[PDB]
């Protein structure tokens, strides 16, 4: 896996014994802990069994002795015995759950151990391919007892726990929740490759009030505040440790060498005298691609958090879903974190009936607090029953809405990934991902076709169709439209068509592709040695070679046939004639139906540029390179103060007086 990864993605993993020993450590941890947990669960029902048995024996003694007052005695006896049964039922039932889990423990914890131990350094695809297609099959082969509908993601954390986590800023893709469970059970705590702040977000919203000592490797006091967190258990936050190479932290935080690992420490201690670490460290690497030595990487762990296409798609898809389906969202959110008291109520009223039993200790038809404590304990079962199924159907609606907005959100996400990589060119375009998503909310939310507001400076909006399908196929466009608009607010008309060209290219690459044959032609220079076949005002001598090269293309090889055929018009064309609506007559452009790009690339530059403009406007409306109206109020006070107002200045223009009047206008 490391091999085909590294020779797929330049990021480098180095294996060691200490990893295999680490897996031993982690598995032994989890197995023994879960065994203790199930143990400390089991006692409850067990104990009450004995008193139930004794009380039932005593009442049966009553009836065997019996062979009007007796009738009422009997009625209390009936309700009592039925209640005692109905209680001890779920008692033994839960205990047998506990032992079934006990049986599955070995294999299930094996899968979870391997999963959460080494799934971190690889992509979702590698993670799935490794686990579900090698080791789960291998656990089928050797057949260690384990349940096969296994999600080890739901083996370090719970939907309530993850619900808080996402509420504390954990992103919604499987990647983020997986990594969150990972650091919730990390033991060499993994280096968190987060060049987008989102892991830092979940940490700071979730893991700060303990006293989050955030600090970087820039001082010798850094060791001393490590001792402070040792003496204080503080979460020390590292920000991009791999900005250097340093040689003191490995004893400090490395958990140096493992054989079977039953011996990890996470906090303050008593026999600890070296004072290396007595606190649970946090790290945040803002570098997307670190590198470390095989020795160096050997002593600590690593986990992915670089935003990808699907991850960003999922975050923003969740945003649009709960933005347009907030109701089932809040139903789910309330129930998932109210189930705690729902369960506590029934188990504790059961406990009250149990202590009513503890007060019996010698009377049954006379310790009648049992009947009272029995009835409510009975119908406290009703509380939890409908919650689970409503949760499941709500999750069904969530998956439904996920896929419904998946095309729309995927197009918008695509366009984001575009502008992300487009930021490689610098000052013509630099916005924040926050500013981005704000434009996104502008496109989905203030979408006067998402609402009924026809009284807007947005008539492209439906303005009358709040209906959700019109909203689908409107807001899908409104997002990307306001995107390219406010992007253009910092763009030059010199490059807006550059933007348009690759926008159309990547849109078709989403819904197909222009092949590396066609597209690599479109890039690499269009010329081979000249062809004397074009003669000679048909085609220029350099264009002779251009045509000759283009006569190899399966979409373009038929060219000299066309030359000999309509020699008249092709002589006409490259004799510097410029029709532009139908520059060349579409006869060959239906004899080719070419990809809108490659023909003039061999032939005609000016009509090529006009054709790029026309084609883009066909896809994207006429408004692409059409310049920005130099606003004063809206595109500035539509946004927040927290996004300050700045301007790029062309030579010989000032908005300072315009800023003043703008003030005086408002």
């Amino acid at each position: 896996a490391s091999e085909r990864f590294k020779e797929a993605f330049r990021r480098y993993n180095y294996t060691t014994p200490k990893s295999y020993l680490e897996l031993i450590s982690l598995y032994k941890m989890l197995l023994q802990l879960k065994r203790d947990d199930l143990r400390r669960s089991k006692e409850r029902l067990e104990n009450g069994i004995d008193k139930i048995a004794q009380a039932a024996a005593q009442v049966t003694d009553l009836q065997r002795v019996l062979k009007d007052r007796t009738a009422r005695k009997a009625q209390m006896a009936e309700r009592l015995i039925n209640g005692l049964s109905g209680e001890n039922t779920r008692w033994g039932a839960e205990i047998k759950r506990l032992e079934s889990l006990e049986g599955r423990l070995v294999g299930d914890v094996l899968i979870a151990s391997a999963f959460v131990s080494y799934a971190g350094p690889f992509n979702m695809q590698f993670r799935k391919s490794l686990v579900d297609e090698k080791w789960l099959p291998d656990i089928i082969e050797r057949q260690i007892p384990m349940t096969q509908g296994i999600r080890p993601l739901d083996l370090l954390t719970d939907d309530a726990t993850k619900a808080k986590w996402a509420n504390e800023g954990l992103p919604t893709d499987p990647l983020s929740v997986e990594n969150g469970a990972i650091m919730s059970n990390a033991s060499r705590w993994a280096l968190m490759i987060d060049p987008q702040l989102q892991g830092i977000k979940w940490i700071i919203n979730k893991e700060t009030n303990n006293g989050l000592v955030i600090i970087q490797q820039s001082q010798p006091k850094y060791i001393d505040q490590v001792i402070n967190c040792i003496e204080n258990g503080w979460p020390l936050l590292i920000e991009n440790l791999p900005v250097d190479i340093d040689a003191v932290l490995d004893p400090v935080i490395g958990k140096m060498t493992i054989k079977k690992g039953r011996n990890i420490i996470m906090k303050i201690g008593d026999a600890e005298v070296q004072y290396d670490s007595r606190f649970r460290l946090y790290l945040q690497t803002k570098l997307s691609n670190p590198h470390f030595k095989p020795e160096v990487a050997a002593q600590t762990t690593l986990v992915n958090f670089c935003v990808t296409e699907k991850g960003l798609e999922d975050q923003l898809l969740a945003l649009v879903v709960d933005h347009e389906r907030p109701d089932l969202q809040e139903q789910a959110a309330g129930l998932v974190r109210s189930l705690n008291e729902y369960n506590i109520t029934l188990v504790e009223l059961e406990n009250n009936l149990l202590f009513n039993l503890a007060n019996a200790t010698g009377n049954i038809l006379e310790n009648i607090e049992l009947i009272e404590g029995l009835e409510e304990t009975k119908r406290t079962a009703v509380e939890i029953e409908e919650k689970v199924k409503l949760a499941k159907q709500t999750e069904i609606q969530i998956a439904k809405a996920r896929e419904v907005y998946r095309p729309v959100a995927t197009r918008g996400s695509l366009t984001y990934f575009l502008i992300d990589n487009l930021n490689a060119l610098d000052r013509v375009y630099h916005y924040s991902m926050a500013n981005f998503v704000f434009v996104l909310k502008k496109g989905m939310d203030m979408t006067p076709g998402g609402k009924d507001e026809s009284k807007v400076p947005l008539a492209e909006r439906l303005n009358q169709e709040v209906d959700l399908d019109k909203r689908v196929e409107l807001l899908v466009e409104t997002t990307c439209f306001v995107l390219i608009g406010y992007v253009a607010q910092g763009l030059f008309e010199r490059h807006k068509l550059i933007v348009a060209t690759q926008l159309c290219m990547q849109i078709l690459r989403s819904r197909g592709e222009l092949h590396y044959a066609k597209f690599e032609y479109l890039l690499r220079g269009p010329k081979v040695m000249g062809a004397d076949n074009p003669l000679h005002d048909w085609v220029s001598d350099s264009v002779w070679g251009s045509v000759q090269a283009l006569k190899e293309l399966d979409d373009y090889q038929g060219l000299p046939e066309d030359l000999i055929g309509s020699s008249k018009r092709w002589r006409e064309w490259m004799e510097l004639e410029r029709p532009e609506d139908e520059p060349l007559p579409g006869d060959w452009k239906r004899m080719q139906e070419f990809d809108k790009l490659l023909l003039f690339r061999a032939l005609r530059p000016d009509r090529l540029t006009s054709a790029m403009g026309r084609f883009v406007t066909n896809m994207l409306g006429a408004k692409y390179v059409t310049s920005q109206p130099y606003d004063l109020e809206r595109s500035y006070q539509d946004a927040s103060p927290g996004t300050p107002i700045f301007v790029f200045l062309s030579p010989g223009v000032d908005v300072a007086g315009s800023v003043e009047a703008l003030g005086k206008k408002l």
Binding site: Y14, T15, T16, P17, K18, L21, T257, K259, E295
Partner: protein
């Protein structure tokens, strides 16, 4: 005498697997050599120490 190198310099642990002892025996040959540079070429983090 496992404890005796389990009480030795900063370990880069490998407890007994066959190949390890075969390497160790090669070196135990090699150590009795002037300039006895047994250059244990391999990956760090594994067993050399």
């Amino acid at each position: 005498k496992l404890r005796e190198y389990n009480e030795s310099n900063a370990v880069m642990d490998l407890v007994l697997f066959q190949q390890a002892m075969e390497h160790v025996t090669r070196i135990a040959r090699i150590i009795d050599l002037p300039r006895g540079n047994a250059m244990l070429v391999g990956v760090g983090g594994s067993g050399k120490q």
